[PDB]
Write a protein that binds this ligand. Sequence first.
Ligand code: VNZ
Lengths: 458, 415, 457, 452
Amino acid sequence: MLQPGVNKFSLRMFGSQKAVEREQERVKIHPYSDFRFYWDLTMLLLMVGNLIIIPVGITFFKDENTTPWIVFNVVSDTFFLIDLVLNFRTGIVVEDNTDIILDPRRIKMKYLKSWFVVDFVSSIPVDYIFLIVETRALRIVRFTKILSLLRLLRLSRLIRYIHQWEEIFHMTYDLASAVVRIVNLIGMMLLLCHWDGCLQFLVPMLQDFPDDCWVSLNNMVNNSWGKQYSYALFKAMSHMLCIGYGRQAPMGMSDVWLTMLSMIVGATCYAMFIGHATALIQSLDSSRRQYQEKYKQVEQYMSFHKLPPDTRQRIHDYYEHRYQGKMFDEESILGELSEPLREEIINFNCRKLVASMNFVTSMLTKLRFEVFQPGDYIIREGTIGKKMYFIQHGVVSVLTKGNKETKLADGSYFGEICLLRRTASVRADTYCRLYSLSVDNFNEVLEEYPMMRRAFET
Amino acid sequence: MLQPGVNKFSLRMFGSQKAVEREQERVKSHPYSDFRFYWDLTMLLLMVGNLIIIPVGITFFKPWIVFNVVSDTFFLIDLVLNSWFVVDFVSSIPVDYIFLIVELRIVRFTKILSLLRLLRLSRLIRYIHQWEEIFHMTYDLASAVVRIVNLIGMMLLLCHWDGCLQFLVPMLQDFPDDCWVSLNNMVNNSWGKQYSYALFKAMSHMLCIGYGRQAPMGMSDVWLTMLSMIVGATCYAMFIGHATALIQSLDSSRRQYQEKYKQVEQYMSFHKLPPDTRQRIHDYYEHRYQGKMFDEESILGELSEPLREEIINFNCRKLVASMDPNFVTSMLTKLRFEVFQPGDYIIGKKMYFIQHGVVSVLTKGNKETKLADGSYFGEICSVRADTYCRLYSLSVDNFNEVLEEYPMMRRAFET
Amino acid sequence: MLQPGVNKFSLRMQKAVEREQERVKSAIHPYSDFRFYWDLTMLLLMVGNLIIIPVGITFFKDENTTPWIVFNVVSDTFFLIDLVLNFRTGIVVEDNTDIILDPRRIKMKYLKSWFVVDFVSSIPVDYIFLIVETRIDRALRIVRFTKILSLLRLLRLSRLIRYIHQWEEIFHMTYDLASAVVRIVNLIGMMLLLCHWDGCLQFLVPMLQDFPDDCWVSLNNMVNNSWGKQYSYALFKAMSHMLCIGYGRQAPMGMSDVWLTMLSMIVGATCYAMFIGHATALIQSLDSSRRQYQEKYKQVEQYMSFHKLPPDTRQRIHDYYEHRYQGKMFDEESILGELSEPLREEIINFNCRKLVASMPLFANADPNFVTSMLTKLRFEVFQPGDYIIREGTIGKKMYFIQHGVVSTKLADGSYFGEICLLTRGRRTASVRADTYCRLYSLSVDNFNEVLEEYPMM
Amino acid sequence: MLQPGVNKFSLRMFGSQKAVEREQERVIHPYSDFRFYWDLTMLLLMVGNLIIIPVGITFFKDENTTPWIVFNVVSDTFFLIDLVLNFRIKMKYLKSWFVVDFVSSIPVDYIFLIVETARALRIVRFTKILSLLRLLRLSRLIRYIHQWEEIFHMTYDLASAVVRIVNLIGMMLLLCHWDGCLQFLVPMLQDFPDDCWVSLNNMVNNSWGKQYSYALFKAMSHMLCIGYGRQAPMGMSDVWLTMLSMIVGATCYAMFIGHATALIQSLDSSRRQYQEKYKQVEQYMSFHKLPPDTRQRIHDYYEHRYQGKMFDEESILGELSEPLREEIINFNCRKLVASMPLFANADPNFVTSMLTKLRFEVFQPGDYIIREGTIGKKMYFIQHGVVSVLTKGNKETKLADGSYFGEICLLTRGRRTASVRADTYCRLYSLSVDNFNEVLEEYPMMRRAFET
Ligand SMILES: COc1cc2c(cc1OC)CC(=O)N(CCCN(C)C[C@H]1Cc3cc(OC)c(OC)cc31)CC2
């Protein structure tokens, strides 16, 4: 299973099949192996369970040496040693370059600059081994508890595993991905609040019961772990939201300093999260802002030249019925694409129109999109012929004595004459989305294409 | 009648009347029709009444039987006329009354079923968006205040929901001694006071001021105020972020003007510019752009040909005609805007058209010639500027292409 | 006298000033000195009223003392005077000299700018109401309605902001950090005025309802305390509502207090939120070229990572950027483009005459095409160790050394290999860069085209 | 060592010692190493006094013992030496901060009380007020730190960002404890009022530890806008001090949060500039109706061409100088363009010009690169991926990195003899025929060599 390649992500990370096979011959543990996926899924599950339950067990409750908590801790930590020794035989992507690092020497030397020390200190049963090497009892309990808090260093594993797997899975960068990111931020913040509540319940217990503690004043001595956890989370979330100090203001120096640090970090983190979410939602609403800026610049330009209200209203109508209220660019998007994709776009969008009438593939590279408005002349009499048109969605009425009122439907074509002084003229009935072809473009595309131009001229 | 026949908001969707007859066969095959507009308006009024009345009735005052049955009739009209199907299927029928047919806990079940009736706010969300672009006034500061007031509006109905919920939860489970009601002794006071205190706790929790006159004691109070605080603060913070972003976007053009002037400040810092020029540059930007930015070239090259023709005509018809439509029009299509500054020398291969201001001519023979709006000069193939002129330019080369492109009387023009 | 004859702000917007006189010779101009001083007198007197009236009408119960009445009536006389002077005045709006000398024109324009508010604020509605009541002749109701109708005078905020805006659009000479501080202190002034008004209201709303036991005045034992020791705590509650600190000493109890607290939380916190957003926007707009430089460097580093460049180049490019743009943007081509001619040639002259005129060929000739080719010059920045030109390479680009000394050693004002342009072939000199030499450049094509367009020399 | 010749990052400013020799030729230098050591000791002693002076003034009533006198006189002497060292350029500085530096450096309070020796208690109050006004090392520290910003900086990445927020929070905690000591000092100077908060809290004779750790709590509660403290102000000098504390704390915290959020947002800017472009393109496909397959095959092209890494190749190349563009293009393309035999014998100048005429191009698997019967227009130097060339009765021949397909019709014409197809995301380097023609017409040295 160490050989990578799964249609869920490998076929998207590597569009062609062969590249995926190339990954396989790279082996001839891999980052993209399915066994790695299963291992990291089980990891995330069990280790998030640890990050949630360990602060509850070690801060609240008594008689920690009971069988269920002990066996849970030892099995989790043994899995942690397993993945720790696995980290000495693995591979990661470096600076986005796909490097297998199947050599243990490399995955040791270059890993000797990572956070390996954090994983070392976290993934060893410090509480048990420190108790054994020592073997004042309350003081030893204090050390073993405060070092048991070091099991929460698995947040580093969580964040690194998320970072290596944030880019693997995507569906659509719309509200679906944005809500995923904001939900991840909210989950991290509630994890922080849970940790802070457990800390504010444990620091009194670590000192043993004070008389100047929030626990004594609130009489939360021997009621329940559920209510105590609920009220500690209450204090932590009130601190970050800046509601207050719960029921009573701090009374003891220990709790004064504790609430000071808790509320400073909570307020700072809440402000950071709120600003990040606001920036994310503005990025979601980015498409409207560009159009708003362009329209405000247009309005200021019209005011700078003192245009009459009729022209201003016509300009407003043209802008609202050209860009449809949110902005895009023809030139840049058609210039930042490879040849096959550009020809695919110009074929699908603009081939049915020409098919209603390799020269064509070279003529299609000169069709300029163009939108007019009702009542506006397209071609005017007395104007030298310089352009034709290819209706994509519009109805143009020819102005002629014979052609009193016509409605040219989709896929029509006019102005072709004088290509090879307009005889007539046409208006716009509805919102017509024309195309265009300058006579110079036709002359060029023809003169680099002579081997059929010798019959085109006829 | 499915025929819209609207010349006020359907005219914005389709400017010409002809498309109206097109919409005619669109009927013969409507969201913009009169009947749908009337139905949506009546349903909108009734559902606003729903959102601001039913939470009051379900929580307080444990008549109203008249209002709920008639409301359900119009909801059924929506479903038969009709993405979000189970939501309407649940919050479109009298679930509370029909639940008793299936069956104190039962009575409580009817109310929590009625709590699902609020989901039409989602229908309002979709509706309020699709009325947003059909009609508009302008993009001035006034419309922004309207948007902010509407934002405050749905956040305030959210406050109403939150207060009703915060009064209901300690009311469903009788009234425990640890509930905020028991602590405030306001068990049997007036409806006004109860609603005021509920909306007050909700207001404080979202606005992060306090809990009120007390602090949560029972587990129900703690957890209720818990989620109240988190959701209220979060939603209010995003609301304020959106409002401030919109306000800052209102005066955008001034912002880009300021950033461009800051970049010019850096540029003048680099080249050790003398203070006189460092002040003249500031004045020239204060009057050329008037502290608010635009780009004439991009806008002109972006507009459709008839529109661009309209603006260029309205700007320069009197200017050029003061010296065939096609030749003069092509000449107009090549005028550049060259706002000058007082005391700046002007001029010889270019001619100048003065739209605004006063220009002076310096010569040794005659003392000067005073010119005004519309006068043409520089016609060859030095002079000063007195006021903040807005001269127009005609480069000789551009004149050459304008002449050569039309050969009907080209040799006559060069003659 | 009514003619605008100032030499401070009318100068900024010279013969046009005489044209301003012309627009008055057709007969008060908004830019007139007397108008400006009179508007300043209203500025002071408006600030005074907006502070005193809410305190006077709320505090100092049974306000039958004479000096307050004298001050109020004289202020009302100034208000009638300035309202009637608002008739037949020039209003420069839309950056256009709309002097509207026509009485109908000034009438309609003033009727387009909160006319009815101006009348209702200017007229002493309290005095007229009391005099008509005395002419006519529930007593306590009339007593409270006296203060209620005197409260109509707070509509003068609209006039105050209108006058300051008529001056805000004039005083815009600075847009540096000083202007940001001016905007910030204006925001703080408006916010503190709202604090003062909310504090006065926190007492007025109870006061107009006498003093019920549920009001905070009763519970705080502040019924009989001094006026200062009441205003201070009222403003304390106003700021405690605005800043979202708390309800004050004790939570709201009565329905009136609860609803007033709700309204104060809204009008307080929302306005403070807009204030904070404005402050953050201004402090970020203070430093923007640094942000743009950071974005450009991030894009360049991102591109450099895209091409898997060796670390030596990844250090050389970083050094080049930090010693070329040095954390602050400058786009020479665009800035020069969007400048009118005379400023452009002035900048180019001051930059380039001493540098380029060192060698004799262009110095001898007439400086018109010389100025043109100077405007055609380009900015180039080099780094030590990189050879500017190579031996056995076609010499086509001269260099005018504005700064630094590079290798013989050439000091500032020298020139690099100008003989290559007039000759042709491969240059045999490999000049070595030794300093951060900011040079100037051109091309042989530019030289050929300037000699073609100007073949006189 | 009063000259800036140093063997550290100062060299990064001025590479060659001859460039450094210019400053040695001109030349106390602020950039000198001795001034560097003096600035570090200034920083250390300045932060020490900025933490200790407000506490020494307020809680330590009549600290007439010798240690405090020694501390104060050492500070006075060292600040005076710093002032006299900080002194041609003085006239430019003359209208700046000499009143500031004079009042900050000298012991105004101590010299004031010497000439004096209920007037005595008022003199003590004046001494305390003068020593408080002497705290202008806030401004001094701001100046000296702001000097360092231009002096040295490695990168503006996340590493420096967290440092910037840490600096802001350190300055803000400086403000916190200043306000904490103030909230005790102002009531203390009046003598403990009955209605004051200290009296209500019974914190009248408690130790320095409590009187500091709860005053700090009170003074940064108003900063985090959490509340007042144990009680409402009650006292009215107290409520005015609460006015000032509320305003300054909330306003400064608002500015600090705005600045920090803006920094963390500008930290990730390229991703935003790519997301905006992708939203624009998404609207482009929404406008001209297209099948979902084309939408997917454009999304894939962006995800494997820009990779979410938003950069503009033309602008980045242009804004660089030629003696820096040359190394980039060389490292990217010397192996590729020297691979084919015809250009291996080409002139280095001709090679570099052809490199400057090279253009980056990307393709997708299954998409034709060159077709059958089309007019040949460009040339290709494959840099990545594998390409499948199909030439009539030919199987899927697979060229690799460094190869070249399309070299035909480099100067000739005719229809395409073969059709190629991309097997992977082959990142090519295109090369148009007209560019080849123009480089040969401006380098006619080997026109006759390439004529064959
Ligand atoms: C009163 O101070 C602020 C208020 C607002 C804003 C900014 C403020 O300070 C940064 C804008 C905003 O997002 N908010 C944040 C609201 C979040 N909390 C709940 C508001 C209150 C608690 C908090 C947190 C603060 O710091 C961010 C703060 O600074 C004085 C004020 C407050 C809404 C209005």
